[PDB]
Amino acid sequence: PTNPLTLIVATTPIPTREKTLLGIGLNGTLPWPRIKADMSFFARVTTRPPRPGTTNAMIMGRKTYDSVPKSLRPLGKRINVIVTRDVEGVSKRVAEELKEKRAKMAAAAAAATSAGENKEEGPITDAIVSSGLEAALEDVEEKFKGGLGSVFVIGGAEIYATALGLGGRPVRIVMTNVEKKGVDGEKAVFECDTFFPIDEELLMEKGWRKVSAEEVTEWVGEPVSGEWKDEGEVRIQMVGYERV
Ligand SMILES: NC(=O)c1ccc[n+]([C@@H]2O[C@H](COP(=O)([O-])OP(=O)(O)OC[C@H]3O[C@@H](n4cnc5c(N)ncnc54)[C@H](OP(=O)(O)O)[C@@H]3O)[C@@H](O)[C@H]2O)c1
């Protein structure tokens, strides 16, 4: 049987007359000020190997790649897989950014060593560029073999849409819900130009099941309560959905 594909996403609800939309992006970035708890959660979960000596891959659309600040990318300690229709051009630029990243990470390792820090086996950092999502999945399987850890689809909307359309991989969604705190017992809504490709079918569980906190916990390898938690002007909670 074939390994699960996990979409991981943060959404914000936007009630419209016809349905609640799930906003994910505005102007090529996220819709909200930085949420430290979502960031660290995303980082720990996407990095965490499912067994020793493996590295997780994140499959992303080219715009989501670009949405990460250049100095932080490709994102460390994972295999970054950038899906594009211009492999040739994007390859050259990713290769360049990887090389700069390698340079930053090497200097840090040398410094860490130099100040008497304990080093240990950890997941590796790579970036590769593919012509499609299916191509990306193939490409990472072929390059990494049994060193491949968990595969995450990290966005954005076009790539998620493609994941959800793949021919029957179980697909699971690990979702962080983001809401503004009420002001006069009313909650404002974030402006978004990019939305998750499905919304009502998750909130109404049509073809999807919302899973126990214990099940999310197993997927992501750290405790998830499914409780709301306050983070400044937002509250957030983590939930999961499996296709039925
Ligand atoms: N809140 C979250 O959890 C989250 C996560 C990720 C992203 N986002 C947000 O979403 C926005 C970006 O989303 P998006 O939907 O506009 O972009 P996206 O899906 O990240 O990327 C679109 C790009 O991916 C490439 N691509 C897409 N489909 C393809 C296919 N079928 N075959 C080959 N290449 C393909 C194309 O790259 P080329 O143009 O280079 O061909 C396309 O322009 C940003 O605002 C970002 O901040 C939010």
Ligand SMILES: C[C@H]1COc2c1c(Oc1cccc(C#N)c1)cc1nc(N)nc(N)c21
């Ligand atoms: C990376 C963008 C794209 O996807 C995601 C991103 C993100 O922002 C950043 C920005 C800079 C570094 C890192 C890191 N590491 C994350 C946060 C995310 N949160 C959730 N819950 N889900 C996703 N898919 C996310």
